[model samples]
Target: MKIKPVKVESIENPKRFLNSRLLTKIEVEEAIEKALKQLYINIDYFGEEYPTPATFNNIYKVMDNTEWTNGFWTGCLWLAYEYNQDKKLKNIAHKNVLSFLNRINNRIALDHHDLGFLYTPSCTAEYRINGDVKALEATIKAADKLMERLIIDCLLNIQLLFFAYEQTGDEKYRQVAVNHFYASANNVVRDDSSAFHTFYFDPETGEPLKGVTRQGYSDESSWARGQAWGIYGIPLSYRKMKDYQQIILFKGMTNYFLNRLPEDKVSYWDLIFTDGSGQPRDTSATATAVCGIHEMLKYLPEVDPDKETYKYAMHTMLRSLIEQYSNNELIAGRPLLLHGVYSWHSGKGVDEGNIWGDYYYLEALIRFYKDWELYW
Candidate 1:
């Protein structure tokens, strides 16, 4: 967790994907249109609720914002609002910030590692985009709330801590962020670059417990979306912390993810289950994985050995995403992405859409569209 400055010999090269076969403007725009269309509809369908989509469009009520999903729904609003500044979506996004403020003020779900998931995309994006002071304060406060807990599959929440550091210049948040960042890498990330879904640390004594699986096929299996989180989450920390070692760690994780893909290029619900494993495809994991590849390519120079390989893999995944997984007419007017696995063992969302999947799908598209800046 020792943070240090590193020399940067290369600038981020997002133009390569822009000109390559990764995605055309038309395709990215089409996908965005589909997402926005449904998101606007969600404003009505999910009035004061959040879409969980676990069982045929089930939603969580907004007042009970303890679940780690509401921010993603609000992120859908922010991303779509940014797309065209649609007043309707912007209004809903603003209302969502208020909800997050209430959630934070009321001390709802503050004991877990999902504070970043709760604040960054919703409150931070509002503050980042609209310059709302309450949102800025709320986001920092949520980070403060999260400081009470150190918890995986939660690395995706690291950006909120980094964002808090930028806003307040508090070294505590940054230090904890780096501590949490390397903590995941040291504890959960295996030597071979594959990652455990979660690692245990006892609460009473803060003693270290063994790594165990909550959502994967087994305790030893690499859950696909959790791996995708590591792939995408670590690089954001790199942008803020500037540790070259993060590049090493995320690249190894990314390589492990790419090498495990099945023949059709879609990821199974778990990476351990590939072709002929008779497992469901987690398009949500593939979407996040492509975004991670884009982030890795952004930090590394053209001279890197695995650069081309990552680009090829990213392109391959996006092709499969748009062609086979995303924006199908079956649910075309519904959600943007389909078939995300929330949990495989308990049969939850195994072949259903979830809020995070749609949010990340729009994020991946916008990332391709203009090298879009993220609120995270």
Candidate 2:
């Protein structure tokens, strides 16, 4: 049966729901603490392969080597360490970061757009938390490798460059990051705030060629996760921007996202998909939006007149996420959030829990409660 596409519309005069509430700070922390404990016990069962998505039984499936998601498991360890300063967590994260040395040194994992995803939360976080210069060096090298691919996913890696520049006071790192941002802004993003997943370019002259849908319904349709990247990723790239165009782009994209969201604020795997075609709801996208919206509220101007709408919509999304997505059954074994859609077209993880989802959900939980440093 064919289902209708979602219709987009803007809210009129959105106001923050002062009475709207989520799980209390202490409750949120306790939930995360329990989830982490469960994560500690349950995740290692996936063996030496890196955790990707989960099996039908809620057990994790392991990737062969250095898949884009390899850093998320280690990110979990690092974030856990940050939360409690547990030596075991630190040691585990440290060991895992070192194991990637062979991948980094041999250049086997150098071509992808996820260097930020792979390095920042694990290696970069290690450097920030432990002051390990080796981890810092590894991150810088990873950034250098990511400079080769200018996909939408590279925005996260650009965030890593920002972190590196802050850590080392190097203007070169920041400059390269800004260059990549412009490349993506010019080539990948269309005028409507919707973005293409991949953009091929002329290598010699840096001329734009074409955009393709690697994980979306079609080249013309906006993949929910890809749009989620914009909701979160663009603001991240714009953190260093003094240009009004960046601000305008950020706001336009933010409004487009808010308009496209369902009343509950959760998203289907692809916005253009027929709903009854078994398109799964992607809580991962919502999680990233939660993180992204919070970041915007923190850094962007509140007096811009659109701030209240963003703020209200952000809380609505977060509330919907916590109420519907976060799995609370500690007794049921895997305690992470559920129903994360990794790639609907590939069928790799249509409706399963994933490491990135869990990490970002945990990250969002922490962001809501107190002063948490973003690993990006």
Compared with the true structure, what per-residue lDDT tens digits does model 2 show for residues 1-376? 1111222234443543333554577767775786686677754664444675544555665565567787887887877777887898887777777866657878865545667888888888788787787788788778767655445666676898888788779888888888877877776676667767643457799787433225777778877777777778777776776555665666766666666566466777776644455667788877888788788777678577676667767677777777787776653336377787776655666788878888888777778776877778
Error of 2 at 276 (Å): 6.3
Clashing pairs in 1: none
Against the hidden reference, what TM-scores do the models get? 0.87, 0.85
Model 1 alpha-carbon miss at residue 41, Å: 2.2
Residues 161-262, model 1: lDDT tens digits = 888888889899888888888777777776667766544557689677433236677778888988898889888778988887888777778877777777
TM-score of 2: 0.85
lDDT of each: 0.75, 0.71
Model 1: per-residue Cα lDDT at residue 123: 91
